[PDB]
Design a protein around this ligand. Structure first.
Ligand SMILES: [Zn+2]
Lengths: 259, 202, 283, 473, 73
């Protein structure tokens, strides 16, 4: 036996725990955030600055709080567009999805019907085949064809409309069989961004800023108890208002934006 | 130069708005605008400000030069009745009248907005027609239930209840027109009026 | 292909219909777009009145919303807040706001009445000039028939009428009126027509077209006076709109601070629905 | 082995530990000059190498620990799994907007499964039992009003309802007052939640059934004597920290954090300087964790393969009754704790009737006598250097903000469901197209004007129809 | 509650110019009166303010072909 460090213990416990296999070869401390494949999620102010939603709120049209000055307001005609676009594709069947979303729904299908060894084996061999070049998801084949037509999975996939919403509700159903942590999708974080934050935001009650459409739609069709093909984002826009009247704007960038 | 069908399609506004920011739809929009002399095919409107290109086959992924046509704000908000009024600018109201096609209603609404906004002595006549248009809007709500006279709620109730067939959709939107509202379209008609009266009288 | 927008097309065609002159078919479209024309100067007077109409429309909608806010106050919140209490600190300033709003209302009605008198006088004078131009055009048309029957180049009546129309549309004699540009329009008519040198015919068409030149020169000074009044009307309209906007902002920032009274967010919505226009519509 | 602790000093070999020994809670004892904080941070790295989000409740007054933990988390890629609530900021200097976001928000009263009764009794600890029955009735009433009424639960509203005349308006005047222009009635509220407050108002000495004016002078001394600790703790929690607690949608709630393996670092300002409110601040966190672990976790979950550790740095100053016990509901969480204190007789100074129980229920003990420590096992004592991880610092310490979404309100979803249930019968019945002919004196005239004209372009035909209509009327 | 006569005359004066404000005055008085007991004295007050709105519509909105060249009387 010998003395250890961060890198030595990480590279020696890489094998017993597969969810640290994508992160063990890189060096993420020296990198900067908001740049690269491994980037932190955006704040609401940085999101509204990136997708160009901001304007100075005119008087007598959207009434400001008298204790609030030198702040910004969001354009609803652009916010509704970007939050509708932040929804995923339609759900029409499990055989028509992304291959990154065909190896997670099989995991939560194995976990929903108490087959945990198969799901843990899928995640382990998937993390190994991701750290070895390009990941293949055909190891998710024999599970998905077995649990596609069970009663609980068909009820959960019938109570929803969109594919991110279906996968988030599948995680919500599968996490009641114990613990399905959100730390085992560090293979999913480089290959997809919207799906990883939709998996990371479910379980919470406050979502991120890159998935507000899918989370508001998930809440709006978990409250009704009905699928809904119309996008229901009418709360989330208002939610962004409550997250954009909080960061104080210096006057140099307050005079810059236009009404 | 086709006719206007009030098409409530569920996955059309997402692809349309996703196209509208990209460069292919923008360069094709400039090509069509130079090809068609900024003329709305649906109602014949003619202006440089706030006009947009729609499809004809419903395919918003595939977009060639032939099927992509140009249209005015009213005839282009007619193609997505499931999200109008909630989509920022642009408004609508469902009315019941069989005497007019949707394109003739859009052309007459352009004429009435030109006679209300930039006044030449015919404000009273256009307001007296627009009154009875709003009264027909009130007539619809007795049949289809209270609250769904606005087109966004009607598109939601349509494509949330599971109808995709052209037969049931054409029998449900029969004898129903989409009158564009003035007070939500004030910025566009005042911009068109100010641009025209500063282009002529300078 | 240098076309005209349909809002301006409807407005221009209907104003030319109000002047009872409907002679050109597509020469209207080639006339009212070019700057060095005559119909553009016959049209440039009431279009500024129409633009002032939309400006006073925005100002009047601001005025209607301010009066609706003060009606919503004055029907309920006058005496439930007695003096020497919480309400009397702002109720007197809201009474001052009521005095300023009724003063602005009387002066804005004075402005609308002066607008109505201006457009009435302008349409009466321009209708007189229009029918005078039509009658003198018929007179000089018969005289041009009698003058061009005996020329060596046989030509019809209507073709030289369209040639005279293109002459008065191509180069202007309404602002730059002098001795040379009249001869320039004469050579433009004789260039639209095939060949005419006319050593006697040139002074003959001078003494015949002197009626049209006199009508145009009488139109020019009246255009100058109408522009001189219309600029002041536009400045008064813009200042009235700005001070109405300040009045509504002060009334709402007063009524936000009242403890036992507040505005209901539904009737305020149905009052605030027609207030979504642009404010920077004047230049 | 699964978890790594240290390497032996004498012969030089490492000493792992197992998950069954780890689920029995550990204990470490070292002074302020022994380097205990870096050892706890290294054990946090040992828990983070296998995907388990440590909860770090620190009360040693360290502002330069968030940089170390953030460098350790960013070193593992799971930067999204981090939440920071900073209780060491200033007092009430956050009003309206803010120049930069300083800390996440935490409100343990909005998503409550009616375990907030137990949460508040262990945040508090026959005047005592009287106050506990009073707050049990109050927590029942406030959770029933949070379930469907327009009242949001936080420290401020309960602090507002700690008075008497509002509660007298609750029970006697049977109306609901708030700090808002509102008049909510109790005539529709059932009897089972309104009776225990009436039974609390019965058992006081001096009561008047008609008015309040005599009984307030009779029983305000007893009311202050039973509610002074609660009103001072809730006044501190609701006035000193208004940007951490007064939210509605809490970014960090302790069921999500232990059920989904997220990392929560909470920093307390001090615990040796003015402990009248700061021990209560730590007790709120440990109380919420204990109440949402023991009695709120809810066909049969399996045991976790990842050991979870809430590394509590000073359990001497904040304390709850029976935190070392873990019920049968929470053994599937893979839960544990690493308690720490300054010195063991100081630990005997620190808590009352508790230092034995935490001494008895925690199996693993570590002694750091002043080369870091030696391990106090059940069988064998071994002198071993602890694990030393030095996280290299980050250029920018950006705390990740969130949104505050809501479900759509019940005044709109009920209307949408009613309109859809009305539209379904219309779409089903087959007689769905409009056929009733209603006519005005206007639409027929404008339709005749559009029909009689023959100009091809529709705009010119429209303006000609408007001309004909104005000429005919 | 019921407003005073001085406040009602101030409401009369504040909407003397615009037609829509006086029509809103009549509609809102009818609304707050059908929320109220609607006494015959309040019916006489409603008749008074309807006479006022009719006088405003009679005196104020008079086109008389102001765009056709015909001036104001
Ligand atoms: Zn059109």
């Amino acid at each position: 036996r010998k003395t250890y460090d961060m890198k030595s213990l990480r590279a020696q416990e890489q094998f017993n725990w597969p969810a640290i296999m994508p992160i063990v070869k890189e060096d993420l401390v020296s990198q900067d955030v908001n740049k690269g494949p491994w980037a932190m999620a955006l704040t609401p102010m940085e999101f509204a600055r990136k997708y160009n939603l901001l304007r100075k709120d005119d008087a007598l049209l959207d009434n400001p709080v008298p204790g609030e000055e030198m702040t910004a307001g969001i354009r609803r005609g652009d916010a509704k567009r970007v939050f509708t676009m932040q929804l995923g594709p339609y759900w029409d069947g499990f055989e028509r999805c992304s291959p990154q979303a065909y190896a997670l729904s099989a995991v939560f299908m194995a976990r929903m019907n108490r087959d945990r060894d198969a799901a843990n084996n899928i995640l382990k061999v998937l993390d190994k085949t991701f750290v070895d070049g390009k990941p293949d998801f055909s190891v998710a084949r024999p599970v998905m064809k077995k649990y596609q037509n069970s009663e609980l999975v068909q009820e959960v996939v019938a109570k929803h409309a969109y594919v991110l919403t279906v996968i988030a509700s599948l995680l919500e159903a599968a996490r009641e069989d114990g613990v399905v942590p959100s730390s085992e999708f560090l293979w999913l974080k480089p290959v997809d961004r919207r799906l990883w934050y939709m998996l990371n935001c479910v379980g919470r009650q406050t979502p991120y800023s890159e998935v507000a459409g899918p989370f508001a739609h998930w809440k709006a069709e978990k409250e009704m108890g009905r699928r809904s093909l119309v996008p229901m984002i009418d709360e989330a826009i208002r939610a962004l208002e409550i997250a954009v009247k909080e960061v104080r704007l210096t006057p140099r960038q307050m005079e810059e934006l236009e009404p | 130069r086709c006719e206007l069908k009030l098409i409530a399609s569920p996955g059309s506004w997402r692809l349309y708005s996703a196209r509208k920011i990209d460069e292919r739809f923008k360069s094709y929009e400039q090509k069509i605008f130079q090809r068609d002399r900024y003329t709305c095919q649906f109602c014949g409107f003619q202006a440089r400000l706030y006009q947009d290109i729609v499809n004809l086959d419903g395919d918003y992924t595939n977009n060639r030069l032939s099927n992509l046509v140009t249209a005015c704000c009213f005839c282009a908000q007619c193609f997505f009745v499931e999200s109008v009024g909630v989509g920022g600018y642009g408004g609508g109201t469902l009315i019941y009248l069989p005497e007019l096609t949707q394109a003739e209603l859009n052309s007459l609404c352009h004429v009435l907005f030109c006679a209300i906004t930039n006044d030449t002595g015919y404000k009273s006549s256009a307001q007296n027609i627009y009154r009875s248009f709003k009264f027909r809007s009130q007539i619809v709500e007795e049949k289809f239930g209270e609250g769904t006279s606005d087109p966004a709620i009607f598109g939601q109730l349509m494509i949330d209840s599971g109808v995709n067939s052209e037969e049931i959709r054409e029998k449900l939107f029969k004898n129903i027109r989409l009158l564009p509202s003035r007070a939500k379209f004030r910025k566009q008609i005042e911009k068109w009026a100010a641009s025209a009266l500063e282009e002529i009288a300078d | 292909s240098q076309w005209l927008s349909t809002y301006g097309t409807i407005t221009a065609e209907r104003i030319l219909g109000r002047y009872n002159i409907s002679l050109p078919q597509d020469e209207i479209l080639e006339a009212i777009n070019i700057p060095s024309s005559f119909y553009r100067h016959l049209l440039q007077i009431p279009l500024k009145n129409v633009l002032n109409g939309i400006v006073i429309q925005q100002a009047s909608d601001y005025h209607v919303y301010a009066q609706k806010l003060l009606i919503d106050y004055l029907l309920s919140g006058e005496s439930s807040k007695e003096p020497d209490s919480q309400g009397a600190g702002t109720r007197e300033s809201l009474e001052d706001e009521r005095q300023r709003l009724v003063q602005l209302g009387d002066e804005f009605h004075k402005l609308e009445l002066e607008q109505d008198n201006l457009i009435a006088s302008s349409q009466a004078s321009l209708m007189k000039i229009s029918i005078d131009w039509n009658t003198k055009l018929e007179t000089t048309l018969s005289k041009l028939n009698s003058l061009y029957k005996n020329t060596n180049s046989k030509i019809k009546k209507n073709a030289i009428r369209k040639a005279l129309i293109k002459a008065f549309i191509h180069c202007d004699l309404v602002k730059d009126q002098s001795q040379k540009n009249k001869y320039q329009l004469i050579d433009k008519l004789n260039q639209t027509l095939a060949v005419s040198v006319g050593a006697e015919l040139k002074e003959s068409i001078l003494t015949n077209l002197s009626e049209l030149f006199q009508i145009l020169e009488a139109l020019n000074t009246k255009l100058d006076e109408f522009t001189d009044r219309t600029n002041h009307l536009s400045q008064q309209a813009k200042s009235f709109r700005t001070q109405f906007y300040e009045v509504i902002l002060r009334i709402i920032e007063l009524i936000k601070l009242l403890p036992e009274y507040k505005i209901d967010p539904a009737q305020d919505a149905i009052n605030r629905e027609p207030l979504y226009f642009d404010r920077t519509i004047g230049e | 082995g699964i978890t790594f602790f240290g390497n032996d000093r004498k012969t030089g070999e490492e000493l792992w530990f197992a998950n069954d020994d780890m689920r029995t809670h550990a204990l470490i004892f070292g002074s302020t000059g022994s380097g205990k904080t870096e050892t706890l941070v290294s054990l946090s790295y040992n828990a983070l190498v296998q995907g388990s989000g440590f909860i770090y409740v620190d009360g040693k007054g360290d502002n330069s620990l968030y940089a170390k933990v953030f460098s350790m988390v960013r070193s593992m890629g799971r930067e999204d799994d981090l939440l920071l609530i900073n209780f060491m900021t200033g007092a009430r200097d956050i009003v309206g907007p803010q120049e930069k976001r300083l800390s996440n928000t935490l409100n343990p009263f909005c998503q409550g499964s009616s375990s907030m009764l137990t949460q508040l009794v262990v945040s508090l600890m026959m005047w005592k039992g009287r106050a506990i029955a009073f707050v049990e009735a109050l927590m029942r009433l406030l959770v029933y009003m949070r379930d469907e009424g327009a009242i949001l639960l936080d420290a401020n509203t309960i602090r507002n309802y700690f008075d008497l005349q509002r509660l007298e308006s609750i029970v006697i005047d049977k109306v609901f007052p708030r700090d808002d222009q509102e008049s909510v009635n109790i005539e529709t509220i059932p009897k089972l939640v309104t009776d225990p407050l009436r039974n609390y108002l019965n058992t006081l000495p001096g009561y008047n059934k008609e008015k309040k004016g005599k009984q307030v002078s009779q029983v305000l001394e007893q009311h202050g004597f039973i509610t002074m600790q609660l009103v001072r703790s809730f006044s501190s929690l609701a006035d000193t920290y208004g940007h951490i607690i007064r939210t509605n949608l809490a970014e960090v709630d302790f069921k999500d954090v232990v059920l989904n393996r997220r990392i929560l670092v909470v920093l307390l300002p001090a615990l040796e300087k003015s402990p009248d409110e700061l021990s209560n601040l730590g007790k709120i966190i440990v109380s919420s964790l204990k109440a949402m672990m023991a009695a709120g976790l809810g066909r049969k979950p399996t045991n976790a393969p990842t050991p979870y550790m809430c590394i509590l740095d000073e359990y001497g100053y904040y304390a709850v009754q029976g935190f070392a016990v873990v019920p049968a509901q929470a053994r599937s969480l893979g839960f544990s704790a690493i308690f720490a204190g300054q010195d063991l007789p100081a630990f005997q100074k620190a808590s009352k009737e508790e230092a034995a129980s935490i001494g008895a229920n925690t199996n693993i003990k570590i002694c750091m006598k002043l080369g870091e420590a030696h391990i106090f096992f059940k069988s064998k004592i071994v002198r071993a250097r602890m694990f030393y991880a030095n996280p290299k610092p980050v250029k920018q310490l950006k705390i990740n903000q969130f949104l505050k979404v809501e479900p759509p309100p019940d005044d709109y979803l009920m209307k949408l469901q009613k309109q859809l249930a009305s539209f379904q019968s219309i779409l089903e019945s087959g007689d769905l197209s409009i056929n009733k002919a209603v006519e005005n004196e206007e639409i027929t005239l404008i339709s005749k004007a559009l029909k009689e004209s023959t100009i091809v372009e529709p705009i010119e035909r429209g303006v000609a129809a408007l001309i004909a209509f104005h000429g005919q009327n | 509650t019921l407003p005073t006569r001085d406040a009602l005359l101030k409401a009369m004066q504040v909407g003397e110019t615009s037609i829509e404000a006086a029509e809103y005055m009549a509609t809102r008085f009818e609304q707050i009166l059908t929320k109220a007991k609607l006494l015959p004295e309040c019916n006489d007050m409603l008749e008074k303010i309807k006479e006022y709105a009719q006088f405003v519509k009679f005196k104020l909105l008079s086109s008389a072909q102001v765009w056709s060249g015909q001036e104001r009387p």
